[PDB]
Design a binder for this molecule. Structure first.
Ligand SMILES: CCCCCCCC/C=C\CCCCCCCC(=O)OC[C@H](O)CO
Ligand SMILES: CCCCCCCC/C=C\CCCCCCCC(=O)OC[C@H](O)CO
Ligand SMILES: *C\C=C(C)/C=C/C=C(C)/C=C/C1=C(C)CCCC1(C)C
Ligand SMILES: CCCCCCCC/C=C\CCCCCCCC(=O)O
Ligand SMILES: CCCCCCCC/C=C\CCCCCCCC(=O)O
Ligand SMILES: CCCCCCCC/C=C\CCCCCCCC(=O)O
Ligand SMILES: CCCCCCCC/C=C\CCCCCCCC(=O)O
Ligand SMILES: [Cl-]
Ligand SMILES: [Cl-]
Length: 264
């Protein structure tokens, strides 16, 4: 996969190489620090909603482990030779991000459905279709980025197919949010709507990073992509988790869970 991504085409100045490295290690540090927060506040969440915060812990460790792996692969694959960082070993590719999305995107989608108060049949059926759509999005996206060096037309076709799953997924999410916000407690019917708009904005940065090879095929585009991934990661995983957890606690408290009431 390393020969198929644009990162393998370029030499990097020390500044470019260090910035990328620092983005990845900063992301590791943010995810594992939020992990502790989610772990600690899980005691303030009613049993009904506690799985939602537990899923955030899983997202944090999953996302953090891959960012840590990328950071090490990044420094293993390049060496400072004659004033630049040059490819030494085929060990870095973005594909690990995609495979990980197969795991974390279901987790992120499940926490939302839980705080929406969906139960039994509807929860299982709704989650099945959302996870199938998300996997379809990720799988077609993954195949497309295998062509970002050798076939930009193929990257566009796979991306268009991926974007159809994305659109259908967002329609299911949005429909369930607007049809069920009336069941939300503690005033969180107003909060869940913002989470939906946060999702739209944060998730849409990923297709933009996907397209960098088409509009910025150079070492600065490599940096920009990692920057957009970092903003998208923090927003779609951390800030999103913080809001899901807020909703979990507020509804727990409204539902008469004392640890939630004593903590608010
Ligand atoms: C690929 C197109 C497949 C689209 C056809 C499948 C539609 C699935 C669907 O829309 O069901 C979601 C429902 O809202 C959950 O209860
Ligand atoms: C490249 C090929 C793909 C072309 C794509 C063109 C179509 C884009 C339109 C919508 C995107 C999805 C937006 C999802 C917005 C959420 C929908 C929603 O909230 O539905 C409310 C429902 O009626 C409950 O009242
Ligand atoms: C880390 C959490 C999430 C939800 C990551 C989400 C990723 C996407 C929504 C990616 C979408 C893509 C699309 C829509 C089309 C181009 C290829 C992508 C897979 C990057
Ligand atoms: C507050 C809690 C702080 C949590 C600290 C997380 C661990 C910090 C970074 C791990 C170091 C990884 C460096 C490998 C880079 C290659
Ligand atoms: C392989 C095809 C797709 C597989 C879809 C599987 C989706 C899993 C279904 C729903 C899991 C949600 C239930 C988790 C327990 C929460 C209930 C509780 O909080 O007590
Ligand atoms: C998954 C469900 C089916 C999804 C879309 C069919 C795949 C279309 C991909 C275009 C192929 C382009 C090519 O092979 O050169
Ligand atoms: C990710 C978003 C992908 C969707 C946008 C791509 C539409 C295809 C546009 C034109 C086809 C490229 C002509 C190349 C020769
Ligand atoms: Cl992830
Ligand atoms: Cl994800």
């Amino acid at each position: 996969n390393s020969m198929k991504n644009i990162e393998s085409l370029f030499d990097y100045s020390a500044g470019q190489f260090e910035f990328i490295d620092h983005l990845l290690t900063m992301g590791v540090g943010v995810h594992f620090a939020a992990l502790i927060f989610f772990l600690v506040v899980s005691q303030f969440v009613a049993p009904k909603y506690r799985i939602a915060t537990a899923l955030s812990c899983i997202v944090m460790v999953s996302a953090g482990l891959i960012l840590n792996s990328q950071a090490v692969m990044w420094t293993d694959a390049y060496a400072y030779v004659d004033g630049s960082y040059q490819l030494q070993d085929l060990t870095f590719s973005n594909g690990y991000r995609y495979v990980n999305w197969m795991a974390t995107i279901p987790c992120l989608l499940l926490q939302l459905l839980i705080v929406l108060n969906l139960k039994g049949k509807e929860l299982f059926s709704t989650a099945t279709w959302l996870i199938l759509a998300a996997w379809g999005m990720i799988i077609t996206g993954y195949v497309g980025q295998l062509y970002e060096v050798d076939d930009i037309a193929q990257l566009m076709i796979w991306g268009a197919v991926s974007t159809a799953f994305f659109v259908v997924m967002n329609w299911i999410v949005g429909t369930k949010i607007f049809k069920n916000r009336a069941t939300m407690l503690g005033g969180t019917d107003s909060t869940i709507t913002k989470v939906f708009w946060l999702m739209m904005f944060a998730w849409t940065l990923y297709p933009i990073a996907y397209l960098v090879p088409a509009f910025m095929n150079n070492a600065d585009g490599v940096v920009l992509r990692q920057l957009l991934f970092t903003i998208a990661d923090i927003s779609s995983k951390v800030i999103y988790g913080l809001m899901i957890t807020y909703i979990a606690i507020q509804q727990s408290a409204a539902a008469g869970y004392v640890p939630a009431q004593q903590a608010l």
